[PDB]
Amino acid sequence: SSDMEYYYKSLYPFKHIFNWLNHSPKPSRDMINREFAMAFRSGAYKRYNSFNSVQDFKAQIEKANPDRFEIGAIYNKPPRERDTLLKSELKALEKELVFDIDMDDYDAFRTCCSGAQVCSKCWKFISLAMKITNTALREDFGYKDFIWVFSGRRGAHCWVSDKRARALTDVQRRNVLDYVNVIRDRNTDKRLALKRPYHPHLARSLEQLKPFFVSIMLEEQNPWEDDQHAIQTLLPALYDKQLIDSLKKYWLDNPRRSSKEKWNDIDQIATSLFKGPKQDSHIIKLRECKEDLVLMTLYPKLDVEVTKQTIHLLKAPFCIHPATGNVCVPIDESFAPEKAPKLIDLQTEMEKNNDVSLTALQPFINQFQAYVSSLLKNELGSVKREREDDD
Amino acid sequence: MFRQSSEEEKKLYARLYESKLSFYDLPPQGEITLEQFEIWAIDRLKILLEIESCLSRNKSIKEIETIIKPQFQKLLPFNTESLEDRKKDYYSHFILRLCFCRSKELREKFVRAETFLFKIRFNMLTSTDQTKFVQSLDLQFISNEEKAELSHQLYQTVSASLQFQLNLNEEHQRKQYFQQEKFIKLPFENVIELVGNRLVFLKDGYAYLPQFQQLNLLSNEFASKLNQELIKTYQYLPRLNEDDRLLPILNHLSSGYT
């Protein structure tokens, strides 16, 4: 508890977070009416907090001293005044569009680690998921005011703060989520449901993921070296029963062939089976199955519960993870979890230097400050364009 | 070469039904009877009750159309020149505004049923009538250069839809149709239901929509404007309370939905 008190009093960037959530140096409804929730070591959890200013925000989080606090929607009236309101009178107006990716969703094909454990070998899943998501957010939706945040142990959170993104309704959020959710079923015993020819989003994502399929899936992770795992995850994605039976029989006669070897066996056995006039069609179908496998293995996997409602609460940036001790820092695609700071290490560094700018947390604070500066500039430009359009 | 050279209410309803459908845009005038008020409201209410019943039974558009179309000739005629039918349709809609503006649940049910009836009747139109009706509502197409630059992405987006929705199984036919097809550009938030199904192409925050689609925008505008008009209708219900002879009828009409 004392370490958390020291963290909020010495290290947490309240000013930058206030500028991000308020969208203004001076106070506004975007902070006054924003819900915050606090989680405590006693097991208690308190909703519907909101803060009048950066000083009030900092003072209340310091005074409460939670393990973590979570960010919710902007409301029509202050959530801290809910005792003056009926439950139907307090209503949401905006929240940042948030996406959540977890490493545990890739355990169908990850091998080097499993569960909430992580390493730089498997974080390439998250890096590619961030890359595909960023391409979608910029090229498809036109967003610019977004930032990625490490969950502290096993995932990454993207906080989109563009004004049009903040204003999305629950129905609109669910449909945006559906647009970016491609692998809508996680079970491995079927080929993907995607229609052909590909929508341009799918085609571009596939072309972005193709150069990394060999190195990550077939060589680094190599999940299909186990024959039973290949029979349970690789073969059901193929289009033909005779091909599946031939591969199963061949691998049971010739066990423990690597994922790369099995990937080549698919082509070789298909070429041996599908001779004659229909050979081009069978080759096309086989290629479709392999393309769908690339998407099935490397495309972003998302927690729908974080995105599908405006009122949802999620662990704020620069929080401390209770088990690992890591800071929930901002990140980019080149990140790995081994690069995250820890509370004990930051306390040690502050004891040695007595200056946050000389700790390992300052590069992440620099990233967040640059993001906030860009966000505020774009907000002011949007207000100027709206005023000129109104004039 | 050779060359040569109240009534207002009737003209109003002729104008309102020249398009064969209406957004129900304008205040009625003149008089009808109280028996007509009750019966016309009940007729439209019966059609909307069956629409909501079929939707609660999860029946498709084709099934609902098969169920509802025989009922127009008996309860609420459509594609008709008769002034009586046109007044019956218009007035019955306006009556059920006053019945169903009363609460959020009633407003939602009435908007849903009436918008689905709007969809049904729009499907009954010829393409010329649809075009004229859309043009009458004062409802941006992309340039040929922009279509050419985005042609690969747009064709990849619509090629499956051309095969399944317009039955164009031949790729040659799809290419010819695509060469003749127009596209609309608007913000992606306006067509988000098509976005979630990946039926439209997205670029820089704008959705690219082919002309053979987009009826959901028309019906959503109908639903939104009807919801706003119902909210307005709710705000001036205290003026309805000046004639007692109408309140039992409206209570009876709303009781079948509660």
Secondary structure (H, E, C), chain B: CCCCCCHHHHHHHHHHCCCCCCCCCCCCCCCCCHHHHHHHHHHHHHHHHHHHHHHHCCCCHHHHHHHHHHHHHHHCCCCCCCHHHHHHHHHHHHHHHHHHCCCHHHHHHHHHHHHHHHHHHHHHCCHHHHHHHHHHCCCCECCHHHHHHCHHHHHHHHHHHHHHHCCCCCHHHHHHHHHHCCEEEEEHHHHHHHHHCCCCEEECCEEEEECCCCHHHHHHHHHHHHHHHHHHHHHCHHHHCCCCCCHHHHHHHHHCCC
- The verdict on whether A226 is a catalytic residue reads no
Count of A–B CB contacts within 8 Å?
55
State how far the Cα of A378 lies from the Cα of B179, in Å rounded to an integer.
39
Contact (CB<8Å) A201/B202:
yes
Nearest to A327 by CA among A363, A300, A372: A363
CA atoms within 13 A of residue A108's CA, in its CB half-sphere: 19
What chain B residue is nearest to A140 in terms of C-alpha separation?
B203
Is B149's Cβ below 8 Å from some Cβ in A? no
- Count, residues in chain A: 391
Q: What are phi and psi of A35, to 5 degrees?
A: -75, 135
Check if the beta carbon of residue A158 is closer than 8 Å to that of residue A98: yes
Nearest to B251 by CA among B43, B106, B79, B44: B106
State how far the Cα of A180 lies from the Cα of B6, in Å rounded to an integer.
58
C-alpha distance from A172 to closest chain B C-alpha (Å): 6
Q: Which helix (H) or strand (E) holds A199?
A: none
State how far the Cα of A345 lies from the Cα of A325, in Å rounded to an integer.
9
Task: Count the Cβ atoms, other than its own, within 10 Å of residue B3.
Answer: 4
**In A274-312, which ranges are continuous DSSP H helix?**
279-298, 304-307
What spatial distance separates the first Cα and last Cα of chain A, rounded to whole Å? 54
Picking from B157, B196, B206, the nearest residue to A200 by CB comes out as B157
CA atoms within 13 A of residue A202's CA, in its CB half-sphere: 26
Scanning B178-197 for CB atoms below 8 A from A yields 187-189, 192-193, 195-197
CA angle B220, A140, A107 (to 5 degrees): 105
Contact (CB<8Å) A200/B193:
no
Nearest to A147 by CA among A19, A310, A331: A331
Contacts of B188 in chain A (CB under 8 A): 140-141
Contacts of A197 in chain B (CB under 8 A): 156, 159-160
| Catalytic residue from among A30, A102, A225, A291 | A102
Two tokens, residue A5: 């008190």
B131 alpha-carbon distance from chain centroid:
13
> Rounded to a whole number, what is the largest CA-CA distance in chain B?
71
Q: What are phi and psi of A11, to 5 degrees?
A: -130, -35
The partner residues of A326 in beta bridges, in order of sequence, read: A342
Check if the beta carbon of residue A222 is closer than 8 Å to that of residue A111: yes
C-alpha distance from A350 to closest chain B C-alpha (Å): 44
Q: How far is CA A38 from CA A68, A84, A154, in A?
A: 6, 21, 21
What spatial distance separates the first Cα and last Cα of chain B, rounded to whole Å? 71
User: Residue A34: left if φ>0, alpha if ψ -120 to 50, beta else—which one?
Assistant: beta
* Gyration radius of chain B over CA positions: 22
| Catalytic residue from among A30, A70, A100, A225 | A100
Burial of A357 (0-12, 13-18, 19+ CB in 10 A): exposed
Specified resolution (Å): 3.5
Nearest to A98 by CA among A22, A166, A14: A166
3-state SS class at A39: strand
Contact (CB<8Å) A139/B203:
yes
- The verdict on whether A185 is a catalytic residue reads no
Is B203's Cβ below 8 Å from some Cβ in A? yes
Is B206's Cβ below 8 Å from some Cβ in A? yes
State how far the Cα of B171 lies from the Cα of B162, in Å rounded to an integer.
9
Check if the beta carbon of residue A152 is closer than 8 Å to that of residue A321: yes
Nearest to A327 by CA among A278, A362, A372, A371: A362
Contact (CB<8Å) B159/A198:
no
Scanning B44-103 for CB atoms below 8 A from A yields none
Check if the beta carbon of residue B33 is closer than 8 Å to that of residue B245: no
Residue B172 amino acid letter: H
Residue A71 amino acid letter: I
The partner residues of B184 in beta bridges, in order of sequence, read: B141, B209
State how far the Cα of B233 lies from the Cα of B98, in Å rounded to an integer.
7
Buried b (16+ CB within 10 A) or exposed e, B232-253: ebbeeeeeeeeeeebeebbeeb
Q: What are phi and psi of A377, to 5 degrees?
A: -65, -45
Contact (CB<8Å) B157/A199:
yes
Two tokens, residue B95: 């009556």
Task: Count the Cβ atoms, other than its own, within 10 Å of residue A71.
Answer: 22
State how far the Cα of A161 lies from the Cα of A41, in Å rounded to an integer.
31
List all residues 6 or more positions away from A116 whose beta carbon is below 8 Å from its beta carbon: A103, A104, A153, A154
Task: Count the Cβ atoms, other than its own, within 10 Å of residue A137.
Answer: 22
Contact (CB<8Å) B156/A198:
yes
Contact (CB<8Å) A141/B159:
no
Answer whether the bond into residue A236 is a cis peptide, omega within 30°.
no
3-state SS class at A123: coil
- The verdict on whether A100 is a catalytic residue reads yes
Picking from B157, B192, B206, the nearest residue to A175 by CB comes out as B192
- A323-326, long-range: CB < 8 A, 24+ apart: A323/A153, A324/A152, A324/A153, A326/A150, A326/A152, A326/A153
C-alpha distance from A90 to closest chain B C-alpha (Å): 17
C-alpha distance from A160 to closest chain B C-alpha (Å): 14
Secondary structure (DSSP) of A139-173: IIS---SEEEEE-SSSEEEEEE--HHHHT--HHHH
State how far the Cα of B76 lies from the Cα of A43, in Å rounded to an integer.
62
